[PDB]
C-alpha cells in the first residue's frame, strides 16, 4: 500500500552485527530489516484494518453507522447473552493440567502487549471516563444493556480506553490506525528480561559479577528467591489489601502480577535464570557478569521455545499442528516474525480456559490449610497470598494437580473473569474480560469472522442455518445471529472461540489457522531460534532436548514429586514420580573449554 514506513517514536540502534546474543529490544534479529520483530513498533496487519471511518474510529463508535447494513451489538450484551454461565459443575478439562492455561498466558506475554494509550496521568479525563461514561476520544466505554444487573450496581458503563498507536500519540489521519506491540515478537523470554534497555538493567544484579538477576531482599521463599517488588505508586497489589501492604512484583513484563499463578510462573523463570548463572559460573569461573547474564538468558530462551513448541503447541493445535508448523527446516530471513494484530485476539482463547478457583496443595497433594481453595477473583494482583501465605510451592502443585477449564459453547467464560475482574485504578472486583476482548477487537479495527474464515481457506456461513452447521450448535448459532445479524459482523474473538475444537486440540479450525501461522512465523523468522544451526553447539542442542517443565519445577522449588507430562491432567500420587527419575539439563557442553 502506497507509503513506505512511518513510526517516529522508536530510535534506531546500529545493530548487533556484533552480538552473539539477541538484543533486549529484539532489534537486529533480521539483518535486512533490523526493526522487524522489534518491540515498540506497530502490530502486523495480515489483513487491512476495518474501522467505521476507514481509518481509526472503531465499529460501534457512531450509533448511526452500521457494519454491513447492521448495528453491531454492545460488547457487554454479547457477553451476557452468550459468554456467561452459572454452573461451574461439569466445566473442567479431564485431559489438561492447570499449567496448560498458565503456560499460554506466559507465552502470550512473551509475544504481545498492546498497552492502552497513556495520554493523561495528570488529567481528570483519566477518571472522567469512569465517573461519567462519556465517549470521549481515547475513552470508549462499554455501555451496559438495559437488563444488566451491573446497571443497578456499578453505573452505566465499564471504563475502557483505546489502545496506544504508532506514529502519533494524538490526532493524525491519512492512513489506518495501527496499535503497538511493546514486547519483542520473539519467543525470547522478554517476559523475564524485559523489552527495554531501561527495564533490562533495573532487573539485573550489577552489584555482583555473577550475572544474576535482581532478587527481592525484602522477603524469601525458604531460601528461594522472589521477584523484586515494584517501585512504584500507585499499585494494584497493595490496594487489594491495604493491610498486608504487599507490592506488585517487578519482571520483564508488566502484567506479571495480574494473578498469582502467573507471578508464580514468573517466579519459576527468575530462579532458573539465577540457577543457570551460578552453575555456568561453576564450570566457567572465568566468564564475566555479562557473559553470565546473556548465556543464562540465552539458555532460558531456548527453554521457553522448546516447552512451547514441543510440549505446548501440539496439544493446542492437535490435528492441525503438522498442517501449520511443519517440523523445522532452518531460519528463513524472508519470513515476517512480527505478531499480527489478529493473533493478540486469537490467543485470547485462553480466557475460556481459566477456571473459577485456585488451590494450594501441601506435599501429599492435599488441601494446604483451611482455605486452601480460593476464588480466582481474589487472586487478581495478589502478591500477599504468596509472600505471607506459603511461597510458590503449594501453588505450583495446584498447577500440576488441578485442571483447566474446558472451552464449552454454553459455558464460555467464568464469572470470575466475566463479572468480577479487577482493573487497576477502577477499584471494584467488577469488570468484564469478555466484554473487553470484544470492545478491543473493535478498538483495533479487526476484520469480521468471515473475512478471517476466507483468509483461512475455510467456508463463510451466511445464514443462520449456515452458521449452525459450522458451529455444530443450533442454539449458539441463533444467539449469535440475533446479536450480530450476520456471520459477517461477528467479532473475531468470539466467532473464533464459538467453533468446536479439532481432533486433539483445544481451539477450532479458524484459530488453529490464525495461531498456527503466527507461531510458524515466529519460529521460522527467528535468527536466534534454539535449533537454528550455529546458535547452540552440537552438544548443547543434545543437552537442551531434555528440558521439561517438570525439571524447572524440581530445580526451582522444593517439590520432589512431579508429572512427567505436565500439561496433561495429572493425578497424585499415581502420575507423580520422583524428581530423580527426570532427565536434567546437563550444562557440561557449556564449558568454555580452553581459554
Ligand atoms: C486475569 C487473566 C487471566 C488469567 C486468570 C488471563 C489469562 C490468559 C490466558 C491463559 C491467555 C492465553 C493462553 C491469555 C491471553 C491474552 N490475554 Fe488474558 N488473562 C487475564 C486478563 C487479561 C486482561 C485484563 C487483558 C487486557 C484486555 C484488554 O484488551 O484490555 C488480557 C488480554 C490478553 C491478551 C492480549 C495481550 C496483548 O497483546 O495486549 C492475550 C493474548 N488478559 N490470557
Ligand atoms: C490482608 O492480608 C492479611 C495478611 O497479611 C490478612 O490477615 C491474615 O489473615 C488472617 C486474619 O484474617 C490470619 O491468618 C490466620 O492466623 C491467625 C494467627 O496465626 C489466626 O488467628 C487466624 O484464625 C487465621 O487462621 C492472619 O493473622 C492475618 N494476618 C494479619 C496481619 O492480620 C487479611 O485477611 C487480608 N485482608 C484481605 C481482605 O485480604
Ligand atoms: C489426552 O492428553 C494427552 C495430551 O497431552 C494425550 O496424549 C497423547 O496423545 C497422542 C494422541 O493419542 C499420542 O501422541 C504420541 O504418540 C506417540 C506414540 O508412539 C508418541 O511417542 C509421540 O510423542 C506422540 O505425540 C500419545 O499416545 C499421547 N502421549 C504419549 C506420551 O504418548 C492423551 O492420549 C489424551 N488422553 C485422553 C484419555 O484423552
Ligand atoms: C547481588 O549479588 C549478591 C550475590 O548474591 C547478593 O549479595 C548476597 O546477598 C545474600 C542475601 O543478602 C547473601 O548471600 C549475602 O548477604 C550476599 N552474599 C554475597 C556472596 O554477595 C545481593 O543480594 C544481590 N543483590 C540483589 C539486589 O539481587
Ligand atoms: C522463506 O520464506 C519465503 C516466504 O515466506 C519463501 O519464498 C517462497 O518461494 C515460493 C517459490 O516456490 C514463492 O511462491 C513465494 O514467494 C514464497 N512462498 C511463501 C509461502 O511466501 C521461501 O521459500 C522460504 N524459504 C524456505 C527455505 O522455506
Ligand atoms: Ca518476546
PDB file of N, CA, C and O in Angstrom, residues 455-520:
ATOM      1  N   UNK A 455      -9.869 -15.976   4.851  1.00  0.00           N
ATOM      2  CA  UNK A 455      -8.431 -15.863   4.949  1.00  0.00           C
ATOM      3  C   UNK A 455      -7.821 -17.191   5.278  1.00  0.00           C
ATOM      4  O   UNK A 455      -6.722 -17.518   4.845  1.00  0.00           O
ATOM      5  N   UNK A 456      -8.537 -17.969   6.063  1.00  0.00           N
ATOM      6  CA  UNK A 456      -8.044 -19.299   6.436  1.00  0.00           C
ATOM      7  C   UNK A 456      -8.510 -20.406   5.467  1.00  0.00           C
ATOM      8  O   UNK A 456      -8.395 -21.610   5.760  1.00  0.00           O
ATOM      9  N   UNK A 457      -9.078 -20.022   4.323  1.00  0.00           N
ATOM     10  CA  UNK A 457      -9.429 -21.027   3.337  1.00  0.00           C
ATOM     11  C   UNK A 457     -10.540 -21.963   3.800  1.00  0.00           C
ATOM     12  O   UNK A 457     -10.719 -23.069   3.265  1.00  0.00           O
ATOM     13  N   UNK A 458     -11.294 -21.492   4.786  1.00  0.00           N
ATOM     14  CA  UNK A 458     -12.437 -22.217   5.293  1.00  0.00           C
ATOM     15  C   UNK A 458     -13.607 -21.478   4.759  1.00  0.00           C
ATOM     16  O   UNK A 458     -13.431 -20.381   4.286  1.00  0.00           O
ATOM     17  N   UNK A 459     -14.797 -22.072   4.859  1.00  0.00           N
ATOM     18  CA  UNK A 459     -16.065 -21.521   4.379  1.00  0.00           C
ATOM     19  C   UNK A 459     -16.583 -20.384   5.210  1.00  0.00           C
ATOM     20  O   UNK A 459     -16.237 -20.251   6.382  1.00  0.00           O
ATOM     21  N   UNK A 460     -17.507 -19.630   4.626  1.00  0.00           N
ATOM     22  CA  UNK A 460     -18.034 -18.441   5.229  1.00  0.00           C
ATOM     23  C   UNK A 460     -19.520 -18.503   5.292  1.00  0.00           C
ATOM     24  O   UNK A 460     -20.168 -18.028   4.380  1.00  0.00           O
ATOM     25  N   UNK A 461     -20.077 -18.961   6.411  1.00  0.00           N
ATOM     26  CA  UNK A 461     -21.517 -19.139   6.512  1.00  0.00           C
ATOM     27  C   UNK A 461     -22.149 -17.758   6.421  1.00  0.00           C
ATOM     28  O   UNK A 461     -21.594 -16.736   6.850  1.00  0.00           O
ATOM     29  N   UNK A 462     -23.325 -17.763   5.823  1.00  0.00           N
ATOM     30  CA  UNK A 462     -24.080 -16.575   5.657  1.00  0.00           C
ATOM     31  C   UNK A 462     -25.429 -16.672   6.312  1.00  0.00           C
ATOM     32  O   UNK A 462     -25.981 -15.663   6.678  1.00  0.00           O
ATOM     33  N   UNK A 463     -26.013 -17.860   6.440  1.00  0.00           N
ATOM     34  CA  UNK A 463     -27.330 -17.943   7.060  1.00  0.00           C
ATOM     35  C   UNK A 463     -27.223 -18.490   8.411  1.00  0.00           C
ATOM     36  O   UNK A 463     -26.238 -19.104   8.755  1.00  0.00           O
ATOM     37  N   UNK A 464     -28.303 -18.307   9.147  1.00  0.00           N
ATOM     38  CA  UNK A 464     -28.487 -18.904  10.432  1.00  0.00           C
ATOM     39  C   UNK A 464     -28.113 -20.381  10.245  1.00  0.00           C
ATOM     40  O   UNK A 464     -27.159 -20.870  10.844  1.00  0.00           O
ATOM     41  N   UNK A 465     -28.811 -21.074   9.355  1.00  0.00           N
ATOM     42  CA  UNK A 465     -28.533 -22.486   9.096  1.00  0.00           C
ATOM     43  C   UNK A 465     -27.086 -22.713   8.711  1.00  0.00           C
ATOM     44  O   UNK A 465     -26.507 -23.740   9.009  1.00  0.00           O
ATOM     45  N   UNK A 466     -26.520 -21.797   7.954  1.00  0.00           N
ATOM     46  CA  UNK A 466     -25.128 -21.963   7.571  1.00  0.00           C
ATOM     47  C   UNK A 466     -24.263 -21.961   8.815  1.00  0.00           C
ATOM     48  O   UNK A 466     -23.403 -22.814   8.989  1.00  0.00           O
ATOM     49  N   UNK A 467     -24.512 -21.019   9.701  1.00  0.00           N
ATOM     50  CA  UNK A 467     -23.710 -20.923  10.906  1.00  0.00           C
ATOM     51  C   UNK A 467     -23.945 -22.122  11.801  1.00  0.00           C
ATOM     52  O   UNK A 467     -23.017 -22.581  12.486  1.00  0.00           O
ATOM     53  N   UNK A 468     -25.179 -22.624  11.813  1.00  0.00           N
ATOM     54  CA  UNK A 468     -25.482 -23.767  12.658  1.00  0.00           C
ATOM     55  C   UNK A 468     -24.552 -24.897  12.274  1.00  0.00           C
ATOM     56  O   UNK A 468     -23.839 -25.443  13.117  1.00  0.00           O
ATOM     57  N   UNK A 469     -24.522 -25.244  11.000  1.00  0.00           N
ATOM     58  CA  UNK A 469     -23.613 -26.299  10.552  1.00  0.00           C
ATOM     59  C   UNK A 469     -22.169 -26.070  10.981  1.00  0.00           C
ATOM     60  O   UNK A 469     -21.532 -26.960  11.508  1.00  0.00           O
ATOM     61  N   UNK A 470     -21.639 -24.881  10.732  1.00  0.00           N
ATOM     62  CA  UNK A 470     -20.243 -24.579  11.140  1.00  0.00           C
ATOM     63  C   UNK A 470     -19.995 -24.680  12.676  1.00  0.00           C
ATOM     64  O   UNK A 470     -19.060 -25.356  13.083  1.00  0.00           O
ATOM     65  N   UNK A 471     -20.821 -24.051  13.513  1.00  0.00           N
ATOM     66  CA  UNK A 471     -20.659 -24.158  14.954  1.00  0.00           C
ATOM     67  C   UNK A 471     -21.072 -25.549  15.468  1.00  0.00           C
ATOM     68  O   UNK A 471     -20.696 -25.985  16.570  1.00  0.00           O
ATOM     69  N   UNK A 472     -21.846 -26.259  14.639  1.00  0.00           N
ATOM     70  CA  UNK A 472     -22.392 -27.516  15.043  1.00  0.00           C
ATOM     71  C   UNK A 472     -23.155 -27.241  16.317  1.00  0.00           C
ATOM     72  O   UNK A 472     -23.076 -27.985  17.286  1.00  0.00           O
ATOM     73  N   UNK A 473     -23.888 -26.137  16.330  1.00  0.00           N
ATOM     74  CA  UNK A 473     -24.674 -25.822  17.512  1.00  0.00           C
ATOM     75  C   UNK A 473     -25.739 -24.892  17.119  1.00  0.00           C
ATOM     76  O   UNK A 473     -25.448 -23.725  16.861  1.00  0.00           O
ATOM     77  N   UNK A 474     -26.972 -25.376  17.138  1.00  0.00           N
ATOM     78  CA  UNK A 474     -28.113 -24.585  16.761  1.00  0.00           C
ATOM     79  C   UNK A 474     -28.260 -23.417  17.650  1.00  0.00           C
ATOM     80  O   UNK A 474     -28.317 -22.307  17.182  1.00  0.00           O
ATOM     81  N   UNK A 475     -28.334 -23.649  18.947  1.00  0.00           N
ATOM     82  CA  UNK A 475     -28.639 -22.545  19.854  1.00  0.00           C
ATOM     83  C   UNK A 475     -27.603 -21.413  19.842  1.00  0.00           C
ATOM     84  O   UNK A 475     -27.950 -20.251  19.684  1.00  0.00           O
ATOM     85  N   UNK A 476     -26.339 -21.758  19.991  1.00  0.00           N
ATOM     86  CA  UNK A 476     -25.293 -20.747  19.982  1.00  0.00           C
ATOM     87  C   UNK A 476     -25.430 -19.982  18.653  1.00  0.00           C
ATOM     88  O   UNK A 476     -25.313 -18.740  18.590  1.00  0.00           O
ATOM     89  N   UNK A 477     -25.764 -20.711  17.592  1.00  0.00           N
ATOM     90  CA  UNK A 477     -25.907 -20.041  16.305  1.00  0.00           C
ATOM     91  C   UNK A 477     -27.117 -19.100  16.222  1.00  0.00           C
ATOM     92  O   UNK A 477     -27.067 -18.124  15.482  1.00  0.00           O
ATOM     93  N   UNK A 478     -28.178 -19.329  17.010  1.00  0.00           N
ATOM     94  CA  UNK A 478     -29.321 -18.400  16.986  1.00  0.00           C
ATOM     95  C   UNK A 478     -28.908 -17.147  17.742  1.00  0.00           C
ATOM     96  O   UNK A 478     -29.078 -16.023  17.292  1.00  0.00           O
ATOM     97  N   UNK A 479     -28.461 -17.363  18.976  1.00  0.00           N
ATOM     98  CA  UNK A 479     -27.960 -16.274  19.805  1.00  0.00           C
ATOM     99  C   UNK A 479     -27.088 -15.389  18.917  1.00  0.00           C
ATOM    100  O   UNK A 479     -27.411 -14.250  18.618  1.00  0.00           O
ATOM    101  N   UNK A 480     -25.984 -15.966  18.496  1.00  0.00           N
ATOM    102  CA  UNK A 480     -25.051 -15.307  17.588  1.00  0.00           C
ATOM    103  C   UNK A 480     -25.737 -14.464  16.528  1.00  0.00           C
ATOM    104  O   UNK A 480     -25.416 -13.278  16.366  1.00  0.00           O
ATOM    105  N   UNK A 481     -26.745 -15.047  15.885  1.00  0.00           N
ATOM    106  CA  UNK A 481     -27.369 -14.400  14.733  1.00  0.00           C
ATOM    107  C   UNK A 481     -28.324 -13.291  15.069  1.00  0.00           C
ATOM    108  O   UNK A 481     -28.558 -12.372  14.255  1.00  0.00           O
ATOM    109  N   UNK A 482     -28.904 -13.390  16.266  1.00  0.00           N
ATOM    110  CA  UNK A 482     -29.850 -12.407  16.758  1.00  0.00           C
ATOM    111  C   UNK A 482     -29.082 -11.226  17.293  1.00  0.00           C
ATOM    112  O   UNK A 482     -29.624 -10.138  17.468  1.00  0.00           O
ATOM    113  N   UNK A 483     -27.802 -11.439  17.573  1.00  0.00           N
ATOM    114  CA  UNK A 483     -26.993 -10.376  18.127  1.00  0.00           C
ATOM    115  C   UNK A 483     -26.330  -9.551  17.034  1.00  0.00           C
ATOM    116  O   UNK A 483     -26.461  -8.325  16.994  1.00  0.00           O
ATOM    117  N   UNK A 484     -25.629 -10.270  16.162  1.00  0.00           N
ATOM    118  CA  UNK A 484     -24.844  -9.635  15.091  1.00  0.00           C
ATOM    119  C   UNK A 484     -25.583  -9.422  13.738  1.00  0.00           C
ATOM    120  O   UNK A 484     -25.190  -8.582  12.926  1.00  0.00           O
ATOM    121  N   UNK A 485     -26.678 -10.185  13.495  1.00  0.00           N
ATOM    122  CA  UNK A 485     -27.492 -10.069  12.264  1.00  0.00           C
ATOM    123  C   UNK A 485     -26.879 -10.716  11.026  1.00  0.00           C
ATOM    124  O   UNK A 485     -27.466 -10.705   9.940  1.00  0.00           O
ATOM    125  N   UNK A 486     -25.687 -11.240  11.212  1.00  0.00           N
ATOM    126  CA  UNK A 486     -24.992 -11.924  10.123  1.00  0.00           C
ATOM    127  C   UNK A 486     -23.639 -12.454  10.534  1.00  0.00           C
ATOM    128  O   UNK A 486     -22.992 -11.938  11.448  1.00  0.00           O
ATOM    129  N   UNK A 487     -23.210 -13.492   9.831  1.00  0.00           N
ATOM    130  CA  UNK A 487     -21.862 -14.087  10.091  1.00  0.00           C
ATOM    131  C   UNK A 487     -20.799 -13.067   9.893  1.00  0.00           C
ATOM    132  O   UNK A 487     -19.740 -13.077  10.517  1.00  0.00           O
ATOM    133  N   UNK A 488     -21.121 -12.153   8.981  1.00  0.00           N
ATOM    134  CA  UNK A 488     -20.163 -11.136   8.528  1.00  0.00           C
ATOM    135  C   UNK A 488     -19.682 -10.254   9.662  1.00  0.00           C
ATOM    136  O   UNK A 488     -18.523  -9.858   9.705  1.00  0.00           O
ATOM    137  N   UNK A 489     -20.581  -9.995  10.596  1.00  0.00           N
ATOM    138  CA  UNK A 489     -20.410  -8.955  11.604  1.00  0.00           C
ATOM    139  C   UNK A 489     -19.921  -9.442  12.950  1.00  0.00           C
ATOM    140  O   UNK A 489     -19.608  -8.610  13.820  1.00  0.00           O
ATOM    141  N   UNK A 490     -19.795 -10.764  13.114  1.00  0.00           N
ATOM    142  CA  UNK A 490     -19.414 -11.353  14.428  1.00  0.00           C
ATOM    143  C   UNK A 490     -17.970 -11.039  14.823  1.00  0.00           C
ATOM    144  O   UNK A 490     -17.042 -11.382  14.131  1.00  0.00           O
ATOM    145  N   UNK A 491     -17.767 -10.415  15.969  1.00  0.00           N
ATOM    146  CA  UNK A 491     -16.401 -10.155  16.407  1.00  0.00           C
ATOM    147  C   UNK A 491     -15.549 -11.436  16.393  1.00  0.00           C
ATOM    148  O   UNK A 491     -15.978 -12.477  16.866  1.00  0.00           O
ATOM    149  N   UNK A 492     -14.324 -11.334  15.869  1.00  0.00           N
ATOM    150  CA  UNK A 492     -13.400 -12.448  15.732  1.00  0.00           C
ATOM    151  C   UNK A 492     -13.080 -13.254  17.007  1.00  0.00           C
ATOM    152  O   UNK A 492     -12.902 -14.483  16.970  1.00  0.00           O
ATOM    153  N   UNK A 493     -12.925 -12.556  18.114  1.00  0.00           N
ATOM    154  CA  UNK A 493     -12.572 -13.196  19.374  1.00  0.00           C
ATOM    155  C   UNK A 493     -13.601 -14.273  19.679  1.00  0.00           C
ATOM    156  O   UNK A 493     -13.280 -15.410  20.032  1.00  0.00           O
ATOM    157  N   UNK A 494     -14.848 -13.880  19.513  1.00  0.00           N
ATOM    158  CA  UNK A 494     -15.950 -14.733  19.879  1.00  0.00           C
ATOM    159  C   UNK A 494     -16.430 -15.717  18.786  1.00  0.00           C
ATOM    160  O   UNK A 494     -16.811 -16.824  19.096  1.00  0.00           O
ATOM    161  N   UNK A 495     -16.356 -15.347  17.514  1.00  0.00           N
ATOM    162  CA  UNK A 495     -16.699 -16.307  16.475  1.00  0.00           C
ATOM    163  C   UNK A 495     -15.640 -17.378  16.396  1.00  0.00           C
ATOM    164  O   UNK A 495     -15.918 -18.543  16.087  1.00  0.00           O
ATOM    165  N   UNK A 496     -14.414 -16.994  16.706  1.00  0.00           N
ATOM    166  CA  UNK A 496     -13.304 -17.924  16.674  1.00  0.00           C
ATOM    167  C   UNK A 496     -13.349 -18.898  17.832  1.00  0.00           C
ATOM    168  O   UNK A 496     -12.876 -20.021  17.710  1.00  0.00           O
ATOM    169  N   UNK A 497     -13.925 -18.495  18.950  1.00  0.00           N
ATOM    170  CA  UNK A 497     -13.957 -19.331  20.107  1.00  0.00           C
ATOM    171  C   UNK A 497     -15.243 -20.192  20.155  1.00  0.00           C
ATOM    172  O   UNK A 497     -15.297 -21.179  20.859  1.00  0.00           O
ATOM    173  N   UNK A 498     -16.230 -19.789  19.378  1.00  0.00           N
ATOM    174  CA  UNK A 498     -17.517 -20.452  19.248  1.00  0.00           C
ATOM    175  C   UNK A 498     -17.467 -21.750  18.447  1.00  0.00           C
ATOM    176  O   UNK A 498     -18.339 -22.566  18.589  1.00  0.00           O
ATOM    177  N   UNK A 499     -16.493 -21.974  17.511  1.00  0.00           N
ATOM    178  CA  UNK A 499     -16.452 -23.241  16.749  1.00  0.00           C
ATOM    179  C   UNK A 499     -15.795 -24.284  17.596  1.00  0.00           C
ATOM    180  O   UNK A 499     -14.876 -24.033  18.368  1.00  0.00           O
ATOM    181  N   UNK A 500     -16.310 -25.497  17.429  1.00  0.00           N
ATOM    182  CA  UNK A 500     -15.892 -26.689  18.174  1.00  0.00           C
ATOM    183  C   UNK A 500     -14.428 -27.005  17.902  1.00  0.00           C
ATOM    184  O   UNK A 500     -13.982 -26.647  16.821  1.00  0.00           O
ATOM    185  N   UNK A 501     -13.745 -27.686  18.834  1.00  0.00           N
ATOM    186  CA  UNK A 501     -12.308 -27.986  18.662  1.00  0.00           C
ATOM    187  C   UNK A 501     -11.856 -29.260  17.925  1.00  0.00           C
ATOM    188  O   UNK A 501     -12.340 -30.359  18.190  1.00  0.00           O
ATOM    189  N   UNK A 502     -10.896 -29.073  16.971  1.00  0.00           N
ATOM    190  CA  UNK A 502     -10.253 -30.137  16.196  1.00  0.00           C
ATOM    191  C   UNK A 502      -9.784 -31.304  17.071  1.00  0.00           C
ATOM    192  O   UNK A 502      -9.474 -31.173  18.252  1.00  0.00           O
ATOM    193  N   UNK A 503      -9.744 -32.470  16.409  1.00  0.00           N
ATOM    194  CA  UNK A 503      -9.243 -33.686  16.937  1.00  0.00           C
ATOM    195  C   UNK A 503      -7.977 -33.394  17.739  1.00  0.00           C
ATOM    196  O   UNK A 503      -6.951 -33.037  17.159  1.00  0.00           O
ATOM    197  N   UNK A 504      -8.052 -33.572  19.047  1.00  0.00           N
ATOM    198  CA  UNK A 504      -6.889 -33.442  19.897  1.00  0.00           C
ATOM    199  C   UNK A 504      -6.307 -32.054  20.074  1.00  0.00           C
ATOM    200  O   UNK A 504      -5.118 -31.910  20.394  1.00  0.00           O
ATOM    201  N   UNK A 505      -7.126 -31.046  19.880  1.00  0.00           N
ATOM    202  CA  UNK A 505      -6.722 -29.671  20.071  1.00  0.00           C
ATOM    203  C   UNK A 505      -7.594 -29.018  21.160  1.00  0.00           C
ATOM    204  O   UNK A 505      -8.286 -29.709  21.904  1.00  0.00           O
ATOM    205  N   UNK A 506      -7.564 -27.680  21.242  1.00  0.00           N
ATOM    206  CA  UNK A 506      -8.383 -27.008  22.198  1.00  0.00           C
ATOM    207  C   UNK A 506      -8.950 -25.736  21.595  1.00  0.00           C
ATOM    208  O   UNK A 506      -9.567 -24.939  22.286  1.00  0.00           O
ATOM    209  N   UNK A 507      -8.737 -25.576  20.281  1.00  0.00           N
ATOM    210  CA  UNK A 507      -9.265 -24.444  19.522  1.00  0.00           C
ATOM    211  C   UNK A 507      -9.895 -25.011  18.251  1.00  0.00           C
ATOM    212  O   UNK A 507      -9.589 -26.129  17.849  1.00  0.00           O
ATOM    213  N   UNK A 508     -10.783 -24.262  17.619  1.00  0.00           N
ATOM    214  CA  UNK A 508     -11.409 -24.776  16.415  1.00  0.00           C
ATOM    215  C   UNK A 508     -10.440 -24.652  15.262  1.00  0.00           C
ATOM    216  O   UNK A 508      -9.270 -24.399  15.491  1.00  0.00           O
ATOM    217  N   UNK A 509     -10.955 -24.813  14.040  1.00  0.00           N
ATOM    218  CA  UNK A 509     -10.198 -24.665  12.778  1.00  0.00           C
ATOM    219  C   UNK A 509      -9.671 -23.254  12.470  1.00  0.00           C
ATOM    220  O   UNK A 509      -8.510 -23.093  12.067  1.00  0.00           O
ATOM    221  N   UNK A 510     -10.494 -22.243  12.671  1.00  0.00           N
ATOM    222  CA  UNK A 510     -10.092 -20.882  12.339  1.00  0.00           C
ATOM    223  C   UNK A 510      -8.894 -20.469  13.219  1.00  0.00           C
ATOM    224  O   UNK A 510      -7.854 -20.029  12.715  1.00  0.00           O
ATOM    225  N   UNK A 511      -9.027 -20.693  14.515  1.00  0.00           N
ATOM    226  CA  UNK A 511      -7.994 -20.374  15.462  1.00  0.00           C
ATOM    227  C   UNK A 511      -6.726 -21.160  15.238  1.00  0.00           C
ATOM    228  O   UNK A 511      -5.620 -20.628  15.404  1.00  0.00           O
ATOM    229  N   UNK A 512      -6.862 -22.429  14.856  1.00  0.00           N
ATOM    230  CA  UNK A 512      -5.661 -23.247  14.668  1.00  0.00           C
ATOM    231  C   UNK A 512      -4.905 -22.702  13.466  1.00  0.00           C
ATOM    232  O   UNK A 512      -3.710 -22.799  13.385  1.00  0.00           O
ATOM    233  N   UNK A 513      -5.632 -22.135  12.514  1.00  0.00           N
ATOM    234  CA  UNK A 513      -5.015 -21.488  11.372  1.00  0.00           C
ATOM    235  C   UNK A 513      -4.364 -20.127  11.766  1.00  0.00           C
ATOM    236  O   UNK A 513      -3.204 -19.906  11.486  1.00  0.00           O
ATOM    237  N   UNK A 514      -5.118 -19.234  12.408  1.00  0.00           N
ATOM    238  CA  UNK A 514      -4.591 -17.950  12.861  1.00  0.00           C
ATOM    239  C   UNK A 514      -3.339 -18.168  13.748  1.00  0.00           C
ATOM    240  O   UNK A 514      -2.262 -17.681  13.442  1.00  0.00           O
ATOM    241  N   UNK A 515      -3.490 -18.969  14.793  1.00  0.00           N
ATOM    242  CA  UNK A 515      -2.426 -19.266  15.746  1.00  0.00           C
ATOM    243  C   UNK A 515      -1.303 -20.012  15.068  1.00  0.00           C
ATOM    244  O   UNK A 515      -0.115 -19.731  15.306  1.00  0.00           O
ATOM    245  N   UNK A 516      -1.689 -21.026  14.299  1.00  0.00           N
ATOM    246  CA  UNK A 516      -0.744 -21.849  13.552  1.00  0.00           C
ATOM    247  C   UNK A 516       0.238 -21.081  12.670  1.00  0.00           C
ATOM    248  O   UNK A 516       1.414 -21.312  12.747  1.00  0.00           O
ATOM    249  N   UNK A 517      -0.244 -20.185  11.812  1.00  0.00           N
ATOM    250  CA  UNK A 517       0.677 -19.383  11.017  1.00  0.00           C
ATOM    251  C   UNK A 517       1.686 -18.623  11.901  1.00  0.00           C
ATOM    252  O   UNK A 517       2.922 -18.688  11.685  1.00  0.00           O
ATOM    253  N   UNK A 518       1.135 -17.862  12.851  1.00  0.00           N
ATOM    254  CA  UNK A 518       1.896 -16.945  13.684  1.00  0.00           C
ATOM    255  C   UNK A 518       3.037 -17.626  14.334  1.00  0.00           C
ATOM    256  O   UNK A 518       4.199 -17.191  14.218  1.00  0.00           O
ATOM    257  N   UNK A 519       2.736 -18.696  15.052  1.00  0.00           N
ATOM    258  CA  UNK A 519       3.823 -19.490  15.629  1.00  0.00           C
ATOM    259  C   UNK A 519       4.786 -19.980  14.539  1.00  0.00           C
ATOM    260  O   UNK A 519       5.988 -20.019  14.737  1.00  0.00           O
ATOM    261  N   UNK A 520       4.276 -20.342  13.371  1.00  0.00           N
ATOM    262  CA  UNK A 520       5.177 -20.790  12.332  1.00  0.00           C
ATOM    263  C   UNK A 520       6.132 -19.669  12.027  1.00  0.00           C
ATOM    264  O   UNK A 520       7.343 -19.878  11.921  1.00  0.00           O
TER     265      UNK A 520
END
